[PDB]
Symmetry: D3
Subunit: 251 residues, 6 copies
């Protein structure tokens, strides 16, 4: 049975859940659910892996979005059809400000829309802005957990490579629009790049759904020393603790 086309879920599967935590990576879903009570796997189809658990006695969904606005737009739409009204994205990210360190946590107030899917919900003039209650819950959760936290604007790119002005690529070329762009965002105070928030925040803010976004910084584009696949996992766990603690305040 499925009430929706991609996720393979029914309303019954949600057990009344109205909040979903939405990481990008299917493999992180089980790990996040493990911070809560009585987690159980619901489904796995394409990049959409879903689990249900209990937070302070209330059902909550954890469901992966895959990379990018398009897959995110599917997961969010179908979760909304199923009854979800609040979405918390938990991600990993690359900071672009020299003063933001690996291990820091970033809470996004709004995003630069360097994506395409957001435009399928609202014209570019519309802000990709987070819900105030969600953002508040994330900031407060960061204080409860104890973290070095920055709150601000994130650049949300449809690509990992040229849209984040990476030159270490097959072509070594960046299209005109994005040449010099990282320095421009840096000067405008943008904290970081990631790949799903513009779509998530725009589609929710324009349809009466609540969304928030938190990420752990696993690399800094300005520093020469690159952490290993050890320190980066610790950072992940930190931000994950925060998103679950934030969810508790939103039930």
């Amino acid at each position: 049975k499925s009430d929706v086309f991609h996720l393979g879920l029914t309303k019954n599967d949600l057990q009344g859940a109205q909040l979903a935590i939405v990481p990008g990576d299917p493999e992180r879903v089980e790990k996040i659910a493990a911070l809560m009570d009585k987690p159980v796997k619901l489904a796995s189809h394409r990049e959409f892996t879903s689990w249900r658990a209990e937070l302070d006695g209330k059902a909550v969904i954890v469901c992966s979005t895959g990379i990018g606005g398009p897959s995110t737009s599917i997961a969010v739409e179908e979760l909304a059809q199923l009854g979800i009204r609040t979405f918390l994205r938990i991600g990993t990210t690359g900071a672009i400000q020299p003063h933001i360190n690996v291990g820091d946590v970033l809470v996004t107030t709004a995003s630069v829309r360097l994506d395409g899917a957001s435009l399928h919900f609202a014209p570019m003039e519309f802000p990709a802005v987070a819900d105030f209650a969600c953002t508040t819950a994330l900031v407060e959760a960061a204080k409860s957990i104890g973290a070095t936290t920055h709150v601000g604007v994130t650049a949300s790119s449809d690509t990992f490579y040229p849209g984040q002005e990476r030159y270490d690529t097959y072509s070594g070329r960046v299209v005109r629009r994005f040449k010099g762009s990282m320095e421009e965002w840096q000067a405008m105070g943008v904290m970081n790049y990631e790949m799903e928030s513009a779509t998530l925040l725009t589609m929710c803010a324009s349809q009466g759904l609540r969304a928030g976004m938190v990420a752990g910084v696993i690399v800094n584009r300005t520093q020469q020393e690159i952490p290993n696949a050890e320190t980066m996992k610790q950072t992940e766990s930190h931000a994950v603790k925060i998103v679950v603690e934030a969810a508790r305040r939103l039930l």
Copy 2:
């Protein structure tokens, strides 16, 4: 008299160390806001820029009007920033476009739809006209503290009072294609209200390391179709912006 800036007629000395400005649109509201604080005093008046200084909890605060629209606002914000202001709180009175937003309610704006031109002089359209979290938090908590009925969300910020707000009661009775059917669209997208300065204010601050927020009292609702409630709503939004200022010093 000496001025450190081109339009406002102010020196750094006039600010006495102020780092926060409350910025209404109308010069006539400047004294009224200043009057709620300690040691209020007139500073200067040039064109639509009337400035007063006051004190909150021993710290200097500025109140300075912006005039109507992004262009005038952009001058005031730039020159105040040159003088040392780092936090800007806009206070306005507004209509509403949602059926359940009532006259007397308070609106705190998280971000704005950019239907202006001046914001593009600071950041490309993809950049969000987003309020500072600390400012928004202070405004929301101030509104709560006095028991106002508060809505928190998105505002549409227009370069015009008439066609950009899809008004047909005009000389031409025409609205350009871009704006035909636009009010119903913003309504469906959850936009609370129209006003005329916030896209410029929020974009220019968010992209230049300045903090900004905005609060407004609702004095009319076209979708729902009085002078007393108007001045009463005013006094309430004003007490909120001053109480928020206290938390941001």
Copy 3:
């Protein structure tokens, strides 16, 4: 009042169909004083209005404030009250080395670096002045022996980054405007100001006549009485347009 902002009724205009529209309220009486029977009508926000008489016909003088948004309110509401011809008068800098302080600029059309013009017509539409108004201004400039430049003005929603000024808090100019001044100079643009794109577009696209004249008081590319000449010119032009 018949309108939302100006505090005027149709009767206040006494049949006036032409308005001179300076930016600053403090210049309104000065302009009105050059005409017969000048009287104050109203003052609200940055909209100060006076009525006077030119060759037996009523004329309005009304300030717009700074920028297209304020200007669009004044023009709309004056149009409702019966105004059909608008003449902007201002003082300006210049971005061409050959244009000197004391010179007079008549604008045939504007570069649309504003937002409000788009609320009246898409960008493809020209922010063009009315031919009769432009003719009147040029001929009025000539009748007083003014050194006159006639051409294109760049009309910016900002005083700072839109005019590519770097002497600012951030010291930054957004990509769109980086290198822009040199581009407009190479395209023969005379000067920057902040209201004409809105004025000219909203009028040209709604059957209203508009023109603009300005006195050059500074020139950023180079190392009072000028305001008076431009002012005499706009009043003389008004005479020919009644």
Copy 4:
């Protein structure tokens, strides 16, 4: 020949600094024949050029072909050869009910519904005519008693969908242009044609003087009018 398309040398111009530029190559000789000492210069592709004399001064008549792209080639190459003033003379319909067949239209500026104008200036820049040229055209129109309308023209890269014509192979008009004629009409636009946005923009942005006059032959909402041609020649006299 110096220039690549026109087949002309600076010497062919004999010092000419003004060109009258019709769209149709077949109209070039007819305009030249109204002036002194008309001489054929060249004919290549849609570019037919003649020289003549007006009050003792050399003038050029050169066709542009239809559309901004070919217009942009003629203007550029003529500018290379010394032309500094360009007067377009066209034939045109009208989109305003009160504009009659026989009337003359002088264009102050154009709605830029073309592509070539963007190769000279961004869209924010006005496709505006030179004041001196427009004045000369209006004054020449008065001198001969022509019923004249002065104002804005819509300059389209197509004859069909861009002018919201549905009487076509597909019968389709793209979203951008659906309902557009009514919009231009409400905005006071006089007429459609196909060269002025490019002409006016490329000249206004490069220090060249341009103007345009057109005779109305049809009306969307409804050759003695010769009248337009007499006007462009009389205007040229005033611009030498």
Copy 5:
């Protein structure tokens, strides 16, 4: 070990492969690889599942892209870094023309760019056009396999719902830009909707990589909104043979 950030693959893993078949669904990768010789699983990370196999003695890669331009752009870039120079997308699609039947095979010559990732490689004026040799190989393979085939333009959308003008949704509405859009594309002869080709074709055509695109029709949108190996899959494998 991995020579690339996301795929978990080294150059050595590819064993000289220069062509990749790139389905959207990770679960379809093993199925496609099984149609070829010596299929071997390489890696699975996020939405990127990769197998290697052999076709007429030459190594070939099958690697999923996930849904959408952004994940597609990662897979294509990293595969290119590892030496892949030809990419054949095999997808599922909703047809928007009355005469196109469920089960038909569509070969895309170029795409309507209703995505965002393509703009990260080339400005909108640049065509999202397929490689001629790849398109030819797909058309010729369709003859070899036997299938009802249509060749033409595809609309490639960053969304499954509003960008394909679907109304079976939470909001039940569609933003201005897309209101009435399906009938517009229909009138312009566009065959179908899918979600990866604009990004794939643009990023390849603008970077000296060859790409082709084929899909099996799973629904006809003029009629309905919610929809061994199919003809389309057999066709992409046969086309690969011709491109090695």
Copy 6:
């Protein structure tokens, strides 16, 4: 006349459903002369038209003039008259260093640096050639053994600034086009010409088949203007295949 500009009636076409469309009116007779029973039909403005016969079937040759606007008139009116397949034969500047003057370039799709294409489809729509037409051109080229390149073409509304030529009256190029040639070059674009974006877009979006081939007359990596036909043979042979 059945149409406003071409001066032709349906009878003039004698059942023709394919047109070869050069830019230059002066080239029409020359192309017609390579086929059977060539007959002049009309000449108005930049539109010169001939009829001829190929393997017993009527074919039209008709000039478009320079640019998308005049091209859009010719194509529309020919469609009204019954033409369903269009083959453009043009001249072009190559922007890749190894492409020789005289080489034949077959266009799969065009960069839309024009305005007329937007009057038929929004910018997101690809200015793509018909597969059958492109196939016929490529196969005709190989059959005569011509040096041929197949790929993307930049199609500009101007000859000068939009093709980043600086040897001009102003010597300036507007921001949008500064550095643009190097960008197209890096993206693999083969060449510049001035009609294909309009032709390919208006045909692909209206159920007409179009193909595009051009002979290289200058290499832009070396000079802006050449010092003071395989392609034609190919367009005619391609036409044979599409009848």
